[PDB]
Amino acid sequence: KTVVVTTILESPYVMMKKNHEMLEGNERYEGYCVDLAAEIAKHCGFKYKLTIVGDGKYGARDADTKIWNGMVGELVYGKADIAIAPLTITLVREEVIDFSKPFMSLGISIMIKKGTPIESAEDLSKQTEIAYGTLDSGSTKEFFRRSKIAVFDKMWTYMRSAEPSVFVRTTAEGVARVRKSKGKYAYLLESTMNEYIEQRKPCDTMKVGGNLDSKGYGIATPKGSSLGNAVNLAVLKLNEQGLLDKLKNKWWYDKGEC
Amino acid sequence: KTVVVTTILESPYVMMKKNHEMLEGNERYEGYCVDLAAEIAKHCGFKYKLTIVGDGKYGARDADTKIWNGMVGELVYGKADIAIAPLTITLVREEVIDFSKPFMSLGISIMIKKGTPIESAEDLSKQTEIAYGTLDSGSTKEFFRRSKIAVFDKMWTYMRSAEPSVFVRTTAEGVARVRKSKGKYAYLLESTMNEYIEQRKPCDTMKVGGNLDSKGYGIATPKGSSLGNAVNLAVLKLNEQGLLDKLKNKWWYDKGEC
Ligand SMILES: N[C@@H](Cc1cc(Cl)c(Cl)c(-c2cncc(O)c2)c1)C(=O)O
Ligand SMILES: N[C@@H](Cc1cc(Cl)c(Cl)c(-c2cncc(O)c2)c1)C(=O)O
Numbered sequence: 121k122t123v124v125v126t127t128i129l130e131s132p133y134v135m136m137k138k139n140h141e142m143l144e145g146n147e148r149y150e151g152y153c154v155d156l157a158a159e160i161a162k163h164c165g166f167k168y169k170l171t172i173v174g175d176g177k178y179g180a181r182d183a184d185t186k187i188w189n190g191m192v193g194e195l196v197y198g199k200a201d202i203a204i205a206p207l208t209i210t211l212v213r214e215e216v217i218d219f220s221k222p223f224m225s226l227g228i229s230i231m232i233k234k235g236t237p238i239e240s241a242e243d244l245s246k247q248t249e250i251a252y253g254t255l256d257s258g259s260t261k262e263f264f265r266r267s268k269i270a271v272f273d274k275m276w277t278y279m280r281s282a283e284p285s286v287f288v289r290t291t292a293e294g295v296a297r298v299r300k301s302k303g304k305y306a307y308l309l310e311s312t313m314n315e316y317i318e319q320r321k322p323c324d325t326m327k328v329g330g331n332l333d334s335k336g337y338g339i340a341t342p343k344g345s346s347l348g349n350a351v352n353l354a355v356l357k358l359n360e361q362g363l364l365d366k367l368k369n370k371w372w373y374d375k376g377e378c
Numbered sequence: 379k380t381v382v383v384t385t386i387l388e389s390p391y392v393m394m395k396k397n398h399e400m401l402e403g404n405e406r407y408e409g410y411c412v413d414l415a416a417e418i419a420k421h422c423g424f425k426y427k428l429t430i431v432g433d434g435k436y437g438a439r440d441a442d443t444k445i446w447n448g449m450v451g452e453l454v455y456g457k458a459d460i461a462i463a464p465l466t467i468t469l470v471r472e473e474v475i476d477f478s479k480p481f482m483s484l485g486i487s488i489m490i491k492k493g494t495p496i497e498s499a500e501d502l503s504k505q506t507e508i509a510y511g512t513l514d515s516g517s518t519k520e521f522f523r524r525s526k527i528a529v530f531d532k533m534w535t536y537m538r539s540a541e542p543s544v545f546v547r548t549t550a551e552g553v554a555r556v557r558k559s560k561g562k563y564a565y566l567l568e569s570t571m572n573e574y575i576e577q578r579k580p581c582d583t584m585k586v587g588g589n590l591d592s593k594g595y596g597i598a599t600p601k602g603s604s605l606g607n608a609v610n611l612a613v614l615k616l617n618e619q620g621l622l623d624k625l626k627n628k629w630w631y632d633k634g635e636c
Binding site: 364 | 467468469472473477480483526527591592593596610611614615617618619620622623
């Protein structure tokens with residue numbers, strides 16, 4: 121009867137509280153998705169347990185084995201009842217799991233060190249003095265790898281061939297690289313995270329230009345799950361009440377350092 | 379086998395071509411949703427017929443009879459197979475029909491005549507010199523009627539009690555009222571339409587301030603419809619290809635007069 125929620129550590133969606141080892145259960149964690157899970161459970165009247173996805177992935181199908189990894193996999197194979205995380209609704213994932221309507225919108229976007237003479241994706245695409253890259257795996261890299269749009273295809277060809285490697289292993293490494301490269305590195309990541317980092321010390325990064333795509337994060341459940349229909353209605357209610365808007369203001373701008 | 383599509387005449391989503399009476403069938407119409415329907419049918423491989431919703435409504439349940447009107451009603455009662463229109467995904471509609479993930483995002487927003495000293499919803503709420511209103515029926519009026527948010531509740535109390543009536547029967551009447559009122563009337567409508575009108579002659583209106591809410595338009599089908607699953611995957615594909623973005627650019631800014 122206790123709902124098994126899979127999620128992932130990713131600021132400010134889910135983080136461990138600084139004093140977590142003194143605490144127990146769901147109270148160990150805080151963040152946008154922590155609050156969102158509590159609001160959903162409250163409205164739906166169920167008990168739940170926050171668990172962290174074992175492989176630290178969002179969800180992709182291995183070409184060789186055809187096995188789904190990440191939170192998507194935990195749902196497909198019945199290891200969890202629901203995923204609450206900044207998990208993008210995509211065509212390939214929609215075919216294997218159910219998604220709520222989006223609880224938050226986003227797009228791929230450009231992060232620069234303040235002063236970097238870049239304003240758009242097209243700008244980056246037409247030069248090489250300012251190196252630019254993204255995560256060495258995951259959805260943004262796949263977006264570029266697969267894009268048939270001229271500018272993005274040019275950007276991909278550059279990134280894959282650029283030396284030294286313009287890719288990084290983690291978002292922290294990416295942001296650290298922006299900050300240390302003296303304007304000579306720009307970073308591609310989701311607008312939500314870009315905006316969050318813009319409001320934190322040392323206040324030396326900025327989101328520039330329009331988003332490169334448009335998509336949403338959804339709550340995910342195994343295909344045909346009865347819990348899925350209910351949680352989707354809950355997300356629609358919370359949105360219509362303005363609670364989702366308050367939640368973003370809480371975690372993005374209220375706790376704003378810049 | 380021919381899919382019955384219900385839709386509604388609403389610029390620039392669906393309009394009759396200036397020479398329509400010389401034409402036949404789907405070719406009579408043009409617009410964002412006309413192109414979107416063609417792109418969906420092409421990908422899904424079905425034939426379809428565009429029909430216009432008989433009562434000219436989007437979809438609401440009559441409190442007395444409990445009967446659904448508009449496009450939602452045509453789906454609920456089996457008069458149409460699918461609705462393709464700027465139809466908002468809402469909690470009450472989601473309970474009675476299926477919706478794709480959103481094909482376009484929007485929010486309620488403020489339209490002013492250029493020069494009108496208003497920048498936000500809060501601005502309007504704290505004064506009465508500049509009258510403000512909305513459609514005399516439909517979703518925006520219902521949004522204000524039902525809102526528990528302080529500023530919007532204040533705005534509703536003002537609108538319902540303001541004399542002369544700040545409400546209008548049609549969007550054209552609303553926009554005409556903005557243009558003729560010499561800065562003494564402001565209008566509340568969906569951001570999509572606000573942005574469209576901003577780019578058309580006489581270029582004397584402007585969208586100001588952030589949106590008041592956040593929501594999406596979805597393709598709708600009867601609950602449990604097998605066509606529904608397929609079209610949803612199609613919408614996700616078109617989005618991921620950038621085709622939805624091209625479609626908005628086509629109808630909003632490419633044909634831009636301002
Ligand atoms: N939405 C993604 C997972 C994800 C979440 C978040 Cl919050 C961020 Cl910020 C990113 C990211 C994307 N590009 C560069 C980066 O450093 C991080 C990726 C999915 O569903 O696969
Ligand atoms: N999305 C709505 C229908 C609808 C569509 C559009 Cl494109 C516009 Cl612009 C409006 C509108 C809202 N407020 C003032 C106005 O003049 C028009 C309403 C629904 O699903 O009920």
